[PDB]
Amino acid sequence: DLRLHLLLNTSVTCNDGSPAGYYLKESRGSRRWLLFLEGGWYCFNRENCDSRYDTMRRLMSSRDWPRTRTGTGILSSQPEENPYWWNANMVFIPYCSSDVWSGASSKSEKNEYAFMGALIIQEVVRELLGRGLSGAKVLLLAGSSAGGTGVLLNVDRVAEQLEKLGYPAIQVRGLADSGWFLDNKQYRHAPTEAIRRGIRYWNGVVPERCRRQFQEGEEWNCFFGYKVYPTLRSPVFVVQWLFDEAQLTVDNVHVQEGLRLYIQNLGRELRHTLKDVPASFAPACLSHEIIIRSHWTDVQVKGTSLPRALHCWDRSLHPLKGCPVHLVDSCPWPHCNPSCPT
Ligand SMILES: *[C@@H]1O[C@H](CO)[C@@H](O)[C@H](O)[C@H]1NC(C)=O
Numbered sequence: 001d002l003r004l005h006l007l008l009n010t011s012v013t014c015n016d017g018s019p020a021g022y023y024l025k026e027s028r029g030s031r032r033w034l035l036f037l038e039g040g041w042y043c044f045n046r047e048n049c050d051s052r053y054d055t056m057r058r059l060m061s062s063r064d065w066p067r068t069r070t071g072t073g074i075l076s077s078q079p080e081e082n083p084y085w086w087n088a089n090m091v092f093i094p095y096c097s098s099d100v101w102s103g104a105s106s107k108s109e110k111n112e113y114a115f116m117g118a119l120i121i122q123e124v125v126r127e128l129l130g131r132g133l134s135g136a137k138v139l140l141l142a143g144s145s146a147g148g149t150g151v152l153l154n155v156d157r158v159a160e161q162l163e164k165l166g167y168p169a170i171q172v173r174g175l176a177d178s179g180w181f182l183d184n185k186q187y188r189h190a191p192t193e194a195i196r197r198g199i200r201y202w203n204g205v206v207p208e209r210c211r212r213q214f215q216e217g218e219e220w221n222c223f224f225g226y227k228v229y230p231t232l233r234s235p236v237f238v239v240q241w242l243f244d245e246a247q248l249t250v251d252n253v254h255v256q257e258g259l260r261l262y263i264q265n266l267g268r269e270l271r272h273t274l275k276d277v278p279a280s281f282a283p284a285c286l287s288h289e290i291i292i293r294s295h296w297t298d299v300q301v302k303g304t305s306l307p308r309a310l311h312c313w314d315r316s317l318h319p320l321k322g323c324p325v326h327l328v329d330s331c332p333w334p335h336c337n338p339s340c341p342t
């Protein structure tokens with residue numbers, strides 16, 4: 001169990017003005033810290049944010065949060081469930097800003113909702129420094145789906161925050177799970193348009209180098225992994241199913257020749273965008289998210305499991321014989337890999 005702490009700075013808030021927070025389980029014998037960003041889509045105007053508030057309120061408010069959470073998968077403290085980092089200090093940051101962790105805007109007389117995702121991350125880091133993070137040697141910022149995109153948008157800002165606060169020895173790294181999307185043509189006919197509107201509605205922020213490349217009005221580009229990743233300085237490990245269910249949903253896919261070619265082309269395009277990503281794990285499965293699932297140890301690429309690949313990544317950051325870090329399936333159809341989730 002990880003225990004809830006609401007932020008002491010109560011001006012950093014969820015969508016409805018209630019305080020944001022984090023769940024923590026400390027491990028006093030460890031200098032490793034895992035901060036995980038929850039996912040859960042987004043909203044991008046008054047009407048569809050009002051709908052989300054009626055039936056997805058825990059993603060917009062802390063008023064109903066429970067006092068504890070069980071750590072699962074990479075957040076588990078049992079070595080049987082988490083071969084990679086079972087002895088680490090564990091942090092789960094709930095997603096209550098509906099802005100893909102990009103927002104910097106308060107609720108006001110002109111704003112019905114607050115969108116503070118980028119500020120929530122920075123405030124969690126600040127308050128944790130007084131609870132042990134000041135002695136860390138590695139801070140791994142991880143996340144799934146909207147939280148995986150949030151890693152890409154925020155990992156270099158966390159690195160800059162700690163450098164400016166006087167902690168240049170903490171190594172900041174990122175782990176992006178299921179947040180690497182393609183701005184491709186839909187099968188029938190979008191993310192690019194909804195994100196462009198959202199950025200304006202949220203006062204959303206993107207990494208500085210990527211912002212400088214694409215410039216004003218084109219910051220939506222930095223929400224797509226293959227465009228923002230080459231601009232990042234912190235080491236980032238990318239986990240991505242080749243046939244991600246959220247990708248197929250936004251593509252209006254729910255088998256004849258036209259759809260067969262569409263699905264095969266999507267897998268090939270995703271594989272191409274990862275060719276020069278040296279730390280990556282990309283199985284040929286139809287699924288969505290993995291790193292906080294209890295059975296995340298089951299899937300393998302080329303005979304290597306995801307917890308093993310992450311361990312090999314740690315060693316590489318001190319090629320290694322028998323301990324690879326770049327693992328991308330080459331077979332072209334969902335579940336051509338026998339270890340895919342059932
Ligand atoms: C609380 O957070 C806000 C928003 O980031 C910031 O402007 C303010 O300085 C913070 N207050 C303290 C005491 O850190």
Ligand SMILES: Nc1nonc1N1CCCCC1
Pocket residue numbers: 040041042100145146149179181182191192223224246250
């Ligand atoms: N980052 C993205 N680019 O396209 N679509 C994206 N996401 C879809 C899932 C929820 C988060 C946003």
